[PDB]
Amino acid sequence: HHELTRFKNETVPSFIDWNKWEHWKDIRNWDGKRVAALFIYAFALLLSCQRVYVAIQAPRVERERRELTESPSPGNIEKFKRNMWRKATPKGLKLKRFIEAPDGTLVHDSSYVGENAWDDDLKKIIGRNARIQTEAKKKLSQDLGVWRERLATWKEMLEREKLSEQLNSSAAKYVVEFDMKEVEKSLREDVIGRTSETEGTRALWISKRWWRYRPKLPYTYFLQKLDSSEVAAVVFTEDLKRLYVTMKEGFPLEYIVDIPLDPYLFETICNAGVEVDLLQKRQIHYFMK
Amino acid sequence: XXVXXXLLNXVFXXXXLXHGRXXQXXXXLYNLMXXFX
Amino acid sequence: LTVLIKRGILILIHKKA
Amino acid sequence: XXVYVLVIKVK
Amino acid sequence: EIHLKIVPPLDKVFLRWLARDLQRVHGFKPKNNTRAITPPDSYIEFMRLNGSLDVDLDDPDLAHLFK
Amino acid sequence: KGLLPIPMINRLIVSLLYLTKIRSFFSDRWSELHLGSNPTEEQDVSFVPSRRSENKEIVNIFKIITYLQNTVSIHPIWLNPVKPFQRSSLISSFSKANRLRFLNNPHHFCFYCNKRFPFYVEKALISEISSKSLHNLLLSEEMRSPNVREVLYSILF
Amino acid sequence: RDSVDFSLRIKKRLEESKKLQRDLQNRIRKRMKKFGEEKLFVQKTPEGEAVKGFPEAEVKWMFGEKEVVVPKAIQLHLRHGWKKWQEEAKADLKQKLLEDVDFGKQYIAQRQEQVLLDRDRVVSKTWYNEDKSRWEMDPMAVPYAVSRKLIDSARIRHDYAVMYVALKGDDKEFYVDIKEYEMLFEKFGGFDALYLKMLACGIPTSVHLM
Amino acid sequence: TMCKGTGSVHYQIKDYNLRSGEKPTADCVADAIVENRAELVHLPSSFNHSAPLPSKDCPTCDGTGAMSCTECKNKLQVRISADDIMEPPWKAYNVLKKMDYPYEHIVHSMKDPSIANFWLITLPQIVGGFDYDEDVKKKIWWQYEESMRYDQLRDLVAKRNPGWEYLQDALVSIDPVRAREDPVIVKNVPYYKAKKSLEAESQKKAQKGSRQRKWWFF
Amino acid sequence: XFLNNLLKVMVXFLXXXX
Amino acid sequence: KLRETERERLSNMEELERKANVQLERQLVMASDWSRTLLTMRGKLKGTEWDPETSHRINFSDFMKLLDSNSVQYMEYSNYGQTISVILPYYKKEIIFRRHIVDRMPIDGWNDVWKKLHQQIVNVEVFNVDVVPAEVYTTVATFVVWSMRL
Ligand SMILES: [Zn+2]
Ligand SMILES: [Zn+2]
């Protein structure tokens, strides 16, 4: 520690002072130590670059060897993915995928199915639904009075596309693009058009059913639960120390948490779009304290 | 290539932000503070 | 909870004990 | 990764 | 009537920076042997919006004598 | 309104335009914005639906728990690839995107299988005016409400 | 090729700005060397309390036993020319308004409509508090009336707690508060900026104790 | 604040009184320093200097970074009010009122005409139920287009077009307080220029080595 | 005082009771 | 026509499956809560992160040095952020978790601190305190201790 302080105080400032660039640019007076430092930088860069080349290229050859040793129309598959993407994401939310190339340039994926999901172009009402097991589907189809190779091939190419998307999600970034006429339409629809009869019915519930029970809930669970918008009620305590939710599914329906004070709590509470009210007391509740 | 014609005259610090009163108002502001100078 | 250090200092603390 | 809205990459 | 005090109970450091930046932006230097400089369309548009080029109807030189 | 500054009102635009980085001298913009805005566009609290919702929960519990018992056991010892995009209104996703630019972290409270949880799942009046002029109140330096003063006086009592 | 020339133009403009700064400092030194000798030094901040977003390291220039601040150079010369352009535009509009008459009456009529709308807007935001029975107006819209020279006179209480302010064309001395005003405007100066704005515009204020 | 809470300020020798007969040598400067005949000045780490000066612990903060308020005196360090039993919501608001609810997560999304036009004009008109005026919208948009100039020139500099140093001086001239913090402005232009040429020479030498290593196994 | 005269010749008539 | 009945029945089983799954999630998380608060009381969690031991304190500079390197990840909170204690692992191979109460978080780091907290925080445990039963217990126990002495 005694030598470390002297190191930090004198050597590194003088190391930069010798490595300063008022004499570096003049190549006609480069000393031997300057050339040694240049060689050190070049060798470090060579080591790092070759190491990352080997580290990047190793799993590619690994998967190539795995595939070598291991070794319903495409329009219909695209339409089935289209139906699932129409089910999943709301209208007015586009997602572009960029793939990280080995050289270092981000390439545009024009074949991503999040690029043109919402853009337009008896048995097939069943082929576009993979949400019920094949055993139940066959048992029910016999009860209907009516092809197993079709479902087998659907399963095979489904798992193929699943593994390909798992492969392509490793080195990729994503960019969202919005459709503001649709954002404004959802604004008019569910923010000024939110006509729920529960305008201010959140705290008087606490006051009435004081004689109920609430168990304890964690914090980061509450944040991760509010990010996915599973909460339609957030009721604060006056002193920013406690919470009483009235949650929309499960049992019991109301909990207790305690909160550390951060603005991003306000940001996430508003980002989820959850109603906010205020539980106001008398003075006699604070006066008997 | 569109803003650059004005930005070349807007690279000159920020006078529009500096200008916020009149000349007479600024003169009154100058003359009405303390007599240190 | 709230400790009273001499020369009049009230220090806030963790839960208790 | 996070969210990388157009104007980060375009401009 | 109109009265004033040279000794207000106001803030002190804010007045110091007000006066210092007033000196830094103007000083005392005037000039006469200079010509007008045409502003960019942004500056002209904003001054039109604030109405700086609105002409002096307030003074009774000849602006309000006829009306 | 001071807890959630967004109105889910004119302080928004001043806060996002001017306040985000000496004198700055410009308070007139605030008034010119708010007063330059012309508005041109039953006190009965029903207790029934919020009472019916938990009864519906009570009804659903029986089937949910029986299905859970029939499927899963325990022992003692796709979509857009960001999760917040799921099951929210479109503006919820639009305002979450401004935060998720820097705050990608969901804090990931899906893991519980540590040593702390052994169990694992198995999916299957002369001087009075002089007194008035004497008193030094010119510097305030306090920085509430009169009912608060009432309870303070009662508490002091 | 285009961006290279844009870079060259920016370089030339900043070179001219630096040259103007150099020759202005030379002129300052030549003009004020008659007083004393230079004591240029970067005076370290003695406050240690500047949490108000205030700059540090006040450069104290002394030419002997005197005080002087180093000014900007090209900013002042832009301001002089733009003030001159403002004045010549005013002169042109004045001359063309005593030459023309029809646009003259149109101009004063448009200004009358401006004043009418301003008055309607500023008096749409008042009330008569019958509990304490005084004409109370939102203090927020008071600087608006300050900006458009709507304030007739102001009587300021002692201890700077509340105001009584008259409006032109009216006979009421409205009662307007300051505590919520500074609670709302702690970020732009507050009552200090307000008072110096009536003082800069020469609004008559009278200090009274009650 | 004088270390900006870091607790490591840069110690610098401003002026050294040299004995008549010597040269300005770093060793003689150190000899004056150990006898304290050189001006030891402390500079905050906020001023990003190209040369890392010797960073020593801040004398004011004792390495803490937290200072007790000298306005709060020992005699007036105590209250008599029953605040701990009777904490009201206004203490919660008082500790709340200095964290500002970050607007930056949307402001850094406002560098776009559509998003900033939605946030700046239309959405308040929708929720509040009113309409703007023409001059109000014009002044809003004019001040906003005045504000966007800094990140416009920032993006122009970041592409590293030839002669970006002039645009970099433009960046440091338009708005200094943001210019003192961005990593996009390199402090020493020859440093990064010859480090770029040195990294280029390094990468060609690396590929020549990685190509010449392939001719010894056959 | 020109604005004072113009404000005097066309005095306001509003209500707003509170 | 009956394929639509097939579709609606598989829709019913899908919805009930989602209901059962969210039920299982909530059951799991309260089960973990009960497991923590039960296993802590037998001394089995003693020495671990949830029940650590007191050690030397930590200053402000050391605290942001811990936070900037993403080291401190389990934290305990008290009194409006005037007291924050950091819990860290120490090599004893046994690995034992220790408590250090950080000294004088001054006033206003929070706008940055919660900016840097959320990136490394995995689990918060805030020890919010009650006031009236605490004072009742304190005065009654003080009488008890002095009465037992006398
Ligand atoms: Zn320090
Ligand atoms: Zn203090």
mmCIF file of N, CA and C in Angstrom, chain A residues 88-154:
data_model
loop_
_atom_site.group_PDB
_atom_site.id
_atom_site.type_symbol
_atom_site.label_atom_id
_atom_site.label_comp_id
_atom_site.label_asym_id
_atom_site.label_seq_id
_atom_site.Cartn_x
_atom_site.Cartn_y
_atom_site.Cartn_z
ATOM 1 N N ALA A 88 -50.807 -11.887 -30.310
ATOM 2 C CA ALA A 88 -49.898 -11.500 -29.236
ATOM 3 C C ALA A 88 -49.801 -9.985 -29.081
ATOM 4 N N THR A 89 -49.300 -9.291 -30.109
ATOM 5 C CA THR A 89 -48.983 -7.879 -29.941
ATOM 6 C C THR A 89 -50.141 -7.001 -30.388
ATOM 7 N N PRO A 90 -50.350 -5.862 -29.722
ATOM 8 C CA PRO A 90 -51.386 -4.929 -30.178
ATOM 9 C C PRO A 90 -50.989 -4.223 -31.462
ATOM 10 N N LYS A 91 -51.969 -3.651 -32.152
ATOM 11 C CA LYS A 91 -51.743 -2.961 -33.413
ATOM 12 C C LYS A 91 -51.071 -1.624 -33.143
ATOM 13 N N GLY A 92 -50.103 -1.276 -33.982
ATOM 14 C CA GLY A 92 -49.334 -0.065 -33.799
ATOM 15 C C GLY A 92 -48.015 -0.239 -33.082
ATOM 16 N N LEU A 93 -47.403 -1.422 -33.160
ATOM 17 C CA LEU A 93 -46.167 -1.740 -32.444
ATOM 18 C C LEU A 93 -45.317 -2.662 -33.315
ATOM 19 N N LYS A 94 -44.353 -2.082 -34.024
ATOM 20 C CA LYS A 94 -43.487 -2.855 -34.904
ATOM 21 C C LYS A 94 -42.119 -3.069 -34.265
ATOM 22 N N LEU A 95 -41.518 -4.222 -34.558
ATOM 23 C CA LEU A 95 -40.226 -4.598 -33.988
ATOM 24 C C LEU A 95 -39.307 -5.072 -35.106
ATOM 25 N N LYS A 96 -38.233 -4.322 -35.351
ATOM 26 C CA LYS A 96 -37.198 -4.698 -36.305
ATOM 27 C C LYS A 96 -36.072 -5.406 -35.565
ATOM 28 N N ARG A 97 -35.501 -6.427 -36.198
ATOM 29 C CA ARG A 97 -34.407 -7.201 -35.626
ATOM 30 C C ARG A 97 -33.139 -6.936 -36.425
ATOM 31 N N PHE A 98 -32.054 -6.613 -35.727
ATOM 32 C CA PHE A 98 -30.733 -6.486 -36.322
ATOM 33 C C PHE A 98 -29.849 -7.606 -35.794
ATOM 34 N N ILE A 99 -29.099 -8.223 -36.688
ATOM 35 C CA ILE A 99 -28.239 -9.353 -36.360
ATOM 36 C C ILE A 99 -26.803 -8.865 -36.250
ATOM 37 N N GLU A 100 -26.129 -9.294 -35.184
ATOM 38 C CA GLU A 100 -24.733 -8.956 -34.938
ATOM 39 C C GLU A 100 -23.839 -9.863 -35.777
ATOM 40 N N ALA A 101 -23.157 -9.279 -36.759
ATOM 41 C CA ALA A 101 -22.257 -10.025 -37.623
ATOM 42 C C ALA A 101 -20.903 -10.227 -36.946
ATOM 43 N N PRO A 102 -20.146 -11.254 -37.357
ATOM 44 C CA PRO A 102 -18.799 -11.439 -36.783
ATOM 45 C C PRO A 102 -17.852 -10.275 -37.033
ATOM 46 N N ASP A 103 -17.993 -9.573 -38.162
ATOM 47 C CA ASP A 103 -17.086 -8.468 -38.457
ATOM 48 C C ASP A 103 -17.349 -7.260 -37.565
ATOM 49 N N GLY A 104 -18.597 -7.052 -37.149
ATOM 50 C CA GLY A 104 -18.906 -5.965 -36.238
ATOM 51 C C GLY A 104 -19.979 -5.012 -36.724
ATOM 52 N N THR A 105 -20.625 -5.345 -37.835
ATOM 53 C CA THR A 105 -21.685 -4.532 -38.412
ATOM 54 C C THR A 105 -23.039 -5.171 -38.125
ATOM 55 N N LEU A 106 -24.019 -4.333 -37.795
ATOM 56 C CA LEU A 106 -25.367 -4.789 -37.476
ATOM 57 C C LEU A 106 -26.159 -4.844 -38.775
ATOM 58 N N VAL A 107 -26.605 -6.039 -39.155
ATOM 59 C CA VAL A 107 -27.317 -6.221 -40.413
ATOM 60 C C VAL A 107 -28.815 -6.230 -40.135
ATOM 61 N N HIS A 108 -29.598 -5.844 -41.140
ATOM 62 C CA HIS A 108 -31.051 -5.730 -41.018
ATOM 63 C C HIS A 108 -31.658 -7.087 -41.355
ATOM 64 N N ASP A 109 -32.488 -7.601 -40.452
ATOM 65 C CA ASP A 109 -33.244 -8.813 -40.738
ATOM 66 C C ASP A 109 -34.578 -8.449 -41.379
ATOM 67 N N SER A 110 -34.658 -8.598 -42.698
ATOM 68 C CA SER A 110 -35.880 -8.330 -43.441
ATOM 69 C C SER A 110 -36.831 -9.518 -43.440
ATOM 70 N N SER A 111 -36.403 -10.659 -42.901
ATOM 71 C CA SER A 111 -37.247 -11.843 -42.804
ATOM 72 C C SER A 111 -37.806 -12.065 -41.408
ATOM 73 N N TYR A 112 -37.599 -11.119 -40.492
ATOM 74 C CA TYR A 112 -38.188 -11.216 -39.165
ATOM 75 C C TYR A 112 -39.705 -11.126 -39.261
ATOM 76 N N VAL A 113 -40.391 -11.988 -38.509
ATOM 77 C CA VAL A 113 -41.846 -12.028 -38.595
ATOM 78 C C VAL A 113 -42.478 -10.967 -37.702
ATOM 79 N N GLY A 114 -41.663 -10.188 -36.993
ATOM 80 C CA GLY A 114 -42.162 -9.039 -36.265
ATOM 81 C C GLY A 114 -42.123 -7.779 -37.106
ATOM 82 N N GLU A 115 -41.639 -7.908 -38.341
ATOM 83 C CA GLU A 115 -41.543 -6.804 -39.291
ATOM 84 C C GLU A 115 -42.837 -6.535 -40.039
ATOM 85 N N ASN A 116 -43.551 -7.585 -40.447
ATOM 86 C CA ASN A 116 -44.781 -7.455 -41.220
ATOM 87 C C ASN A 116 -45.915 -8.287 -40.632
ATOM 88 N N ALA A 117 -46.029 -8.323 -39.302
ATOM 89 C CA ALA A 117 -47.052 -9.141 -38.658
ATOM 90 C C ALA A 117 -48.451 -8.594 -38.920
ATOM 91 N N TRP A 118 -48.643 -7.292 -38.726
ATOM 92 C CA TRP A 118 -49.962 -6.685 -38.862
ATOM 93 C C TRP A 118 -50.257 -6.178 -40.268
ATOM 94 N N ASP A 119 -49.346 -6.362 -41.219
ATOM 95 C CA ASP A 119 -49.572 -5.929 -42.592
ATOM 96 C C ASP A 119 -50.333 -7.004 -43.357
ATOM 97 N N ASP A 120 -51.303 -6.576 -44.161
ATOM 98 C CA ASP A 120 -52.097 -7.513 -44.937
ATOM 99 C C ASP A 120 -51.339 -7.944 -46.194
ATOM 100 N N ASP A 121 -51.829 -9.015 -46.806
ATOM 101 C CA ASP A 121 -51.218 -9.572 -48.006
ATOM 102 C C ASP A 121 -52.186 -9.522 -49.183
ATOM 103 N N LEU A 122 -62.976 -25.148 -41.868
ATOM 104 C CA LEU A 122 -63.291 -26.074 -40.787
ATOM 105 C C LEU A 122 -62.038 -26.782 -40.286
ATOM 106 N N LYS A 123 -61.154 -27.158 -41.208
ATOM 107 C CA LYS A 123 -59.900 -27.796 -40.828
ATOM 108 C C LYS A 123 -58.782 -26.801 -40.563
ATOM 109 N N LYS A 124 -58.746 -25.679 -41.285
ATOM 110 C CA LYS A 124 -57.658 -24.725 -41.094
ATOM 111 C C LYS A 124 -57.936 -23.777 -39.934
ATOM 112 N N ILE A 125 -59.158 -23.791 -39.396
ATOM 113 C CA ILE A 125 -59.411 -23.088 -38.137
ATOM 114 C C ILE A 125 -58.798 -23.867 -36.980
ATOM 115 N N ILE A 126 -58.372 -25.101 -37.255
ATOM 116 C CA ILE A 126 -57.716 -25.925 -36.249
ATOM 117 C C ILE A 126 -56.205 -25.939 -36.466
ATOM 118 N N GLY A 127 -55.763 -25.836 -37.723
ATOM 119 C CA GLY A 127 -54.337 -25.875 -38.010
ATOM 120 C C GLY A 127 -53.587 -24.638 -37.553
ATOM 121 N N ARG A 128 -54.293 -23.521 -37.378
ATOM 122 C CA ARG A 128 -53.707 -22.299 -36.848
ATOM 123 C C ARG A 128 -53.930 -22.146 -35.350
ATOM 124 N N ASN A 129 -53.916 -23.244 -34.595
ATOM 125 C CA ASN A 129 -54.091 -23.214 -33.142
ATOM 126 C C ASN A 129 -53.269 -24.345 -32.530
ATOM 127 N N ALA A 130 -52.094 -24.002 -32.003
ATOM 128 C CA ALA A 130 -51.248 -24.978 -31.332
ATOM 129 C C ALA A 130 -51.366 -24.915 -29.815
ATOM 130 N N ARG A 131 -52.559 -24.635 -29.285
ATOM 131 C CA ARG A 131 -52.734 -24.420 -27.853
ATOM 132 C C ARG A 131 -53.427 -25.583 -27.148
ATOM 133 N N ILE A 132 -53.663 -26.696 -27.838
ATOM 134 C CA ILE A 132 -54.289 -27.882 -27.261
ATOM 135 C C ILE A 132 -53.502 -29.101 -27.726
ATOM 136 N N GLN A 133 -53.334 -30.074 -26.829
ATOM 137 C CA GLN A 133 -52.477 -31.226 -27.077
ATOM 138 C C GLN A 133 -53.004 -32.078 -28.231
ATOM 139 N N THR A 134 -52.078 -32.792 -28.882
ATOM 140 C CA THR A 134 -52.449 -33.647 -30.006
ATOM 141 C C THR A 134 -53.256 -34.859 -29.555
ATOM 142 N N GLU A 135 -53.034 -35.337 -28.326
ATOM 143 C CA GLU A 135 -53.834 -36.440 -27.799
ATOM 144 C C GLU A 135 -55.289 -36.021 -27.627
ATOM 145 N N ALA A 136 -55.513 -34.864 -26.995
ATOM 146 C CA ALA A 136 -56.863 -34.333 -26.858
ATOM 147 C C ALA A 136 -57.472 -34.001 -28.213
ATOM 148 N N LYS A 137 -56.662 -33.484 -29.142
ATOM 149 C CA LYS A 137 -57.161 -33.161 -30.475
ATOM 150 C C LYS A 137 -57.632 -34.411 -31.213
ATOM 151 N N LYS A 138 -56.867 -35.504 -31.130
ATOM 152 C CA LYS A 138 -57.283 -36.742 -31.790
ATOM 153 C C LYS A 138 -58.495 -37.365 -31.103
ATOM 154 N N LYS A 139 -58.515 -37.353 -29.764
ATOM 155 C CA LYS A 139 -59.641 -37.901 -29.015
ATOM 156 C C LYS A 139 -60.929 -37.148 -29.331
ATOM 157 N N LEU A 140 -60.826 -35.828 -29.486
ATOM 158 C CA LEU A 140 -61.973 -35.007 -29.839
ATOM 159 C C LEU A 140 -62.340 -35.118 -31.316
ATOM 160 N N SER A 141 -61.356 -35.336 -32.195
ATOM 161 C CA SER A 141 -61.638 -35.507 -33.616
ATOM 162 C C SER A 141 -62.363 -36.814 -33.893
ATOM 163 N N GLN A 142 -62.047 -37.874 -33.143
ATOM 164 C CA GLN A 142 -62.843 -39.092 -33.253
ATOM 165 C C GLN A 142 -64.279 -38.870 -32.796
ATOM 166 N N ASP A 143 -64.478 -38.093 -31.732
ATOM 167 C CA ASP A 143 -65.813 -37.734 -31.273
ATOM 168 C C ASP A 143 -66.539 -36.795 -32.229
ATOM 169 N N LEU A 144 -65.823 -36.128 -33.134
ATOM 170 C CA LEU A 144 -66.439 -35.270 -34.139
ATOM 171 C C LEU A 144 -66.920 -36.056 -35.347
ATOM 172 N N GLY A 145 -66.244 -37.150 -35.688
ATOM 173 C CA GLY A 145 -66.624 -37.950 -36.834
ATOM 174 C C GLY A 145 -65.813 -37.630 -38.072
ATOM 175 N N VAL A 146 -64.505 -37.465 -37.904
ATOM 176 C CA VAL A 146 -63.624 -37.155 -39.022
ATOM 177 C C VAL A 146 -62.220 -37.678 -38.747
ATOM 178 N N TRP A 147 -54.104 -38.010 -41.653
ATOM 179 C CA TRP A 147 -53.898 -36.589 -41.398
ATOM 180 C C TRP A 147 -52.920 -36.389 -40.247
ATOM 181 N N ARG A 148 -52.563 -37.492 -39.588
ATOM 182 C CA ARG A 148 -51.598 -37.435 -38.496
ATOM 183 C C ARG A 148 -50.205 -37.074 -38.992
ATOM 184 N N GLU A 149 -49.886 -37.409 -40.245
ATOM 185 C CA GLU A 149 -48.629 -36.965 -40.836
ATOM 186 C C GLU A 149 -48.578 -35.449 -40.966
ATOM 187 N N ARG A 150 -49.726 -34.805 -41.197
ATOM 188 C CA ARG A 150 -49.767 -33.347 -41.265
ATOM 189 C C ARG A 150 -49.360 -32.727 -39.934
ATOM 190 N N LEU A 151 -49.950 -33.204 -38.835
ATOM 191 C CA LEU A 151 -49.607 -32.664 -37.523
ATOM 192 C C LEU A 151 -48.180 -33.030 -37.134
ATOM 193 N N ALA A 152 -47.709 -34.206 -37.562
ATOM 194 C CA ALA A 152 -46.324 -34.590 -37.303
ATOM 195 C C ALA A 152 -45.349 -33.644 -38.000
ATOM 196 N N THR A 153 -45.604 -33.343 -39.278
ATOM 197 C CA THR A 153 -44.745 -32.418 -40.014
ATOM 198 C C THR A 153 -44.835 -31.009 -39.442
ATOM 199 N N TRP A 154 -46.037 -30.602 -39.018
ATOM 200 C CA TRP A 154 -46.203 -29.311 -38.357
ATOM 201 C C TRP A 154 -45.361 -29.237 -37.091
#
